[PDB]
UniProtKB/Swiss-Prot annotation:
GO MF terms held by the record: light-driven active monoatomic ion transmembrane transporter activity; monoatomic ion channel activity; photoreceptor activity
TM region(s), chain numbering: 7-26, 41-59, 77-93, 105-124, 132-151, 170-188, 201-220
Gene (UniProt): bop
Name of this chain's protein: Bacteriorhodopsin
CDD domains reported for this sequence: 7tm_bacteriorhodopsin
Species of the source: Halobacterium salinarum (strain ATCC 700922 / JCM 11081 / NRC-1)
Length: 231
């Protein structure tokens, strides 16, 4: 018996990420269109990275104890190593779908790195009140990203192939609804106010992670928008 009550959700998350990796890897076999190859490679790497980090949490490697509030608090730091590499890849899927300009992609990836990097600092900070200063900076970086996705990409997708505009609009709406939930769980969870216990928080993140990575990929890779217009 594992002593951590949240282990059942880490085990399920590891299995779904693994099955998602294998499904995408087999579906991509034989795809020869170079454009589709780009989206298969980016989208298959997302669950493959998350699989190794969920496994590290399940085995206890990606966990550490952070003193704050007079209590040793168990912080899963492996979540941020996961998100550092998977969240910019998800943004690249959207940016390449709309043929975004290079300067915009750099702005998105750079703000994404600030978002995850300050969230890591906030999770490891020992002065309790300062943890919410880093939460606020990270959340401001996210709001810059959400703005670009609505008032920068949407304007350009509408001037492209109808299948690209329709698929982008769906993946854009999914992204904004799912990404906006992460700061709320972090704030009321063990990393912040501590109102939700760690076992329920782990359940919430696992549902969000699978929907935002596997659910996101199932919508993208079944669409014709990833293929170049050909006869
Ligand atoms: C798509 C099909 C799948 C649908 C799945 C979506 C569900 C997402 C998970 C939700 C939160 C549930 C958390 C369980 C509630 C536990 C809270 C509780 O009862 O705590 C009691 C405490 O002892 C006294 O307050
Ligand atoms: C039980 C199963 C557990 C889950 C599996 C273990 C994951 C770790 C292993 C391998 C990395 C394999 C390669 C990952 C890179 C995939 C990129 C890709 O396939 O892109 C296709 C593109 O079209 C090509 O040009
Ligand atoms: C397109 C870009 C593709 C990017 C592909 C990158 C995927 C790498 C994945 C995983 C291993 C992560 C391991 C992180 C190493 C942490 C080890 C550490 O520093 O631990 C310190 C201390 O010993 C204990 O707390
Ligand atoms: C956590 C930090 C590490 C991970 C961060 C991920 C950043 C990935 C790199 C670059 C974006 C630079 C612009 C790349 C966009 C090029 C798309 C394009 O416009 O087409 C040109 C392309 O060469 C086809 O011809
Ligand atoms: C645009 C989409 C993304 C937006 C993301 C930003 C949303 C920030 C929301 C709320 C602050 C609410 C804070 C409430 C925390 C109070 C906890 C507390 O101290 O109360 C203890 C508890 O009530 C005793 O049981
Ligand atoms: C792999 C799945 C997704 C959708 C991951 C998204 C992560 C975030 C939106 C993280 C947000 C954070 C902020 C803005 C503030 C608290 C710390 C976080 C890093 C969790």
């Amino acid at each position: 018996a594992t002593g951590r009550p949240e282990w059942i959700w880490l085990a399920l998350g590891t299995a779904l990420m693994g099955l998602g990796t294998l499904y995408f890897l087999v579906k991509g076999m034989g795809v020869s269109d170079p454009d589709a190859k780009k989206f298969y490679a980016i989208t298959t790497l997302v669950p493959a990275i998350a699989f190794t980090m969920y496994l590290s949490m399940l085995l206890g490697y990606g966990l550490t104890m952070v003193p704050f509030g007079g209590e040793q608090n168990p912080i899963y730091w492996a979540r941020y190593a996961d998100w550092l590499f998977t969240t910019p890849l998800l943004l690249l899927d959207l940016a390449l779908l709309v043929d975004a300009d290079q300067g915009t992609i750099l702005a998105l990836v750079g703000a994404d790195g600030i978002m995850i990097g300050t969230g890591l600092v906030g999770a490891l900070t020992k002065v309790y009140s300062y943890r919410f200063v880093w939460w606020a900076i990270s959340t401001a970086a996210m709001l810059y990203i959400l703005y670009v996705l609505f008032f920068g990409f949407t304007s350009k997708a509408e001037s492209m192939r109808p299948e690209v505009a329709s698929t982008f609009k769906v993946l854009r709406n999914v992204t904004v609804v799912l990404w906006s939930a992460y700061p709320v769980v972090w704030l009321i969870g063990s990393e912040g106010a501590g109102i939700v216990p760690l076992n329920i928080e782990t359940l919430l993140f696992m549902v969000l992670d699978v929907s935002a990575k596997v659910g996101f990929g199932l919508i993208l890779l079944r669409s014709r928008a990833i293929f170049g217009e050909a006869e």
